[PDB]
From a paper:
A smaller fraction of PRE complexes without EF-G is in a rotated state with tRNAs in hybrid (H) states, denoted H1 or H2 depending on the orientation of the A-site tRNA elbow region relative to the LSU. The ratio of H1 to H2 on rotated ribosomes is independent of EF-G, indicating that factor binding or GTP hydrolysis do not affect the tRNA dynamics on the LSU. However, these thermal motions alone, in the absence of EF-G, are not sufficient to promote the displacement of tRNAs together with the mRNA on the SSU. tRNA movement on the SSU is the rate-limiting step of translocation in the absence of EF-G11 and is slow in the absence of GTP hydrolysis.
Numbering used by the authors:
A (entry chain 2): 1 to 46
B (entry chain C): 1 to 271
C (entry chain T): 1 to 93
Amino acid sequence: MKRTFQPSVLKRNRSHGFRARMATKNGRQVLARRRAKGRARLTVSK
Amino acid sequence: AVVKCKPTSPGRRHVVKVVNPELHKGKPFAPLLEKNSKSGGRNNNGRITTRHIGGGHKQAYRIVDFKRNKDGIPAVVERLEYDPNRSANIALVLYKDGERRYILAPKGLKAGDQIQSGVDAAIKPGNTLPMRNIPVGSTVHNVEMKPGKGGQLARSAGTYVQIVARDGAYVTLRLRSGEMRKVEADCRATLGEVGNAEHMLRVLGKAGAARWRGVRPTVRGTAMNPVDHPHGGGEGRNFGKHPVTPWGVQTKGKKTRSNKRTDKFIVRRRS
Amino acid sequence: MIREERLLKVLRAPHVSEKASTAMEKSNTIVLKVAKDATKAEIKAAVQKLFEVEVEVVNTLVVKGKVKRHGQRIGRRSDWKKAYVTLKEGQNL
RNA sequence: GCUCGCCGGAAGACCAAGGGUUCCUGUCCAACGUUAAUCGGGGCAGGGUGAGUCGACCCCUAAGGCGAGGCCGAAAGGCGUAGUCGAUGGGAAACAGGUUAAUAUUCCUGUACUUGGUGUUACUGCGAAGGGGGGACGGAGAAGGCUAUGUUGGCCGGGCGACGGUUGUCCCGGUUUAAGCGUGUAGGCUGGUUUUCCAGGCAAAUCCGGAAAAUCAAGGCUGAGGCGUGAUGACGAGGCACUACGGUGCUGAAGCAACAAAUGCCCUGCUUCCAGGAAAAGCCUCUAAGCAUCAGGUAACAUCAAAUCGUACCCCAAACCGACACAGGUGGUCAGGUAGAGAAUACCAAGGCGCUUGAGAGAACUCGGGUGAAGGAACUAGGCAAAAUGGUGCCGUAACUUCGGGAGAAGGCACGCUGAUAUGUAGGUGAGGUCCCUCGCGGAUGGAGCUGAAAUCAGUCGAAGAUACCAGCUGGCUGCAACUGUUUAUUAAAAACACAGCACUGUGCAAACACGAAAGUGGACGUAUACGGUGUGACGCCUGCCCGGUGCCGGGAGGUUAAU
RNA sequence: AGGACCGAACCGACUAAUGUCGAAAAAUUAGCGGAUGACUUGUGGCUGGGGGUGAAAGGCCAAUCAAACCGGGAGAUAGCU
């Protein structure tokens, strides 16, 4: 019963991290759609 | 060389080894080695372009001297070796000056022979020189297609190309496929067949031997579903189609060649 | 050379505790509280300048912040850096 | 606290990942805890994570990512050169003891070691993005040497036993010591040294590669381990003091041999096999531009520095992934005794637990088991499930066979303990002393001691000696698939898929083909003994007729026919 | 030597019972197959939606797959309830 979420902070940050978002045009627009909604935690960094 | 293996195990029952006992047992010559990472068939875009590739043993790359661009300098063979990147073997040769280079191993090239390239080469096998100094009718291998290009024809195990004619600046060559083809008289070529002519006689016995040469299984489009292959579907071994590749194009006889740039050199196409 | 304007900023407070008094008695170490930045060189010079003692070696460690809730809202105390400053022989005050 | 019981290749111990204070102390019992709770991984407060050497960081790179310029693309952007990042790999150095309520290779005691700086002194050619070396590499097998460790004996301390006996071949406990430093072993590999030259190592090289000549035959490298020092130190069963009755205080004897021994280490070795088994820095060396008296390099001293981050705790789980204090999942490391081939299994050690509702009762019925008269598949869709067989040695073993198999076919017999052969043998180990020498960690000896199976004979006990756990049911005919394998995560594991093998077919390399508006990439750093597609599916014997339809290959007499 | 044999770790999942508001949104118990290899596993990476990958089952692509999930077109449309 290997559940789907097997955590790893390295994989987490390289996939959904801030720098991961900011690398690409489409990700720089996820941070825009989150600053829009006014999210406290923009990305996964903690 | 060609030895049938005793059936002490199913999967050993049909193996036919090719045990050439003069290959240098041990490690290759380091300065002529380099990384060679398996691709998996995958390409630039990371998608499989060539199917049924991936796996098998890790194998280094042996920088083979194909140009053979050392003239006047005689070279002595010193080691016949096993190259996993070819079907032929290779032959570490040592020049008078002190350079070592792997070359394809011809049929009679044994450790101790002497060879040299350039127009002043003798026509004993293992020598390379332009197919303007080589006599018509001779058997040659490691043929170039453009002068200095490097050597692209007759490189497999036991494959050779014979200079059939010579119409001034060009040279007709009966390629191992049966097709004749003009090749500029300056295109260098090395004499005699290539070694390891028994290569074709191994039988591999089992599926794992296909595997560890980097060959993944090949599904028959008949077994697939209508979505995967043009063949496919049908409530139990139904075909009704003309045999086509997985991409619709017809196979079982359909000329896919279209070059129009090099067909001026193809004197007589293969048979 | 460390500027005294920084040396007067480094040290925060003496850390008083059972283990701190224990280290003082049986090992002549003054447990301290220093700023988070606080290189060991920073701390050693600050001690030798502001207490005028002779330090043999410093051994820092960063203490994390307890997640201390206050009522319903969740809280988080701050990280701080401890400094086990071992004096040679001289004295503490 | 005593007794009982459970795990003990784990249900113990240490980690990584992940978590994030759950760690320790005091304190409280509302809520949380499937019950009560004084207790807690709960609430509140305080404390606790100490590094030149252990990880990270850092240096170097793999796959891969990004990518100045560049090429391509309606725009976004795609690809990619230099370059730059990217461990899961490569790169310097610390161990033992003690100590905390909670940290320890971090603190303290002792004993080290590494890399840089900076002077000093003395010798001095130094100088890199560049050359060369090394780093640096597989699978399997076979041993031999040793160690971890264990067992026994000795030695030391203690006891002489609640019930027959227990001054003895008696019982109990201990019998530990590291890094480092110095030897340089069992071993493994290499032939050394010198002079001369050389179209090769993108220049240069005094280095590597090469050709010789001389000259010697040994030199060199690697290396477990052991041995000495480290260490007359620590540790040490216990004893004597006092009590928070929880440990601090002091002292502390012996501290050895033999045998067995690893899956650990020599071994990145050796032997072999084909499938032919990273890179790059660190390190060594060579010169270039440059200085060349300098600078810089070397060695001895002296001192300096070694930053920052992590360090508590769980980690096969109540702390991580599963909504839960969830019978699930989770990579690595260490692995004691007896019996055992064994990391199985049984019982135990160190250690840790009794799984967070109990108390009774002793209905039906359900679940997990034990036993069963006579019969023995009559059950049933079906011997489903149970039952049964189950080990080692020797004898023996059918059709068929592709000569390997089938086969552990089938079947039969023996098995405990005691004694003798032989107060323990064959074997293994191997002491002293005796020599011999290039004297060593040497060699021949030489057999004390230890260890020690197996067998034969005789006796003896039981219903039963493979006595428990553990541990094949067997045989006949037949369909299909050659076989091993893969398969529908979560109702289908098959005859399906794959396969080796066979054939047809395309493809001459700017290969076909595929991904791509393109560039480009794979194919392949391959070259027709290669590569793709399709079908069939080992092997043996073979694979017959039909070219009308459809497709493909070619042909050109004519008909028809687009843009123009 | 072996895609050899028996058999633990390890991987898998053939049968049966249980469980079926479960201890568990696929497990437990007892047996079962492979167990030096077409093996298994840790870390990191690459491939993406008419697309990927597929020893091929329409299998898998985050408990979702004959076309994922999220947001939008969007208050789709619904002679139907």
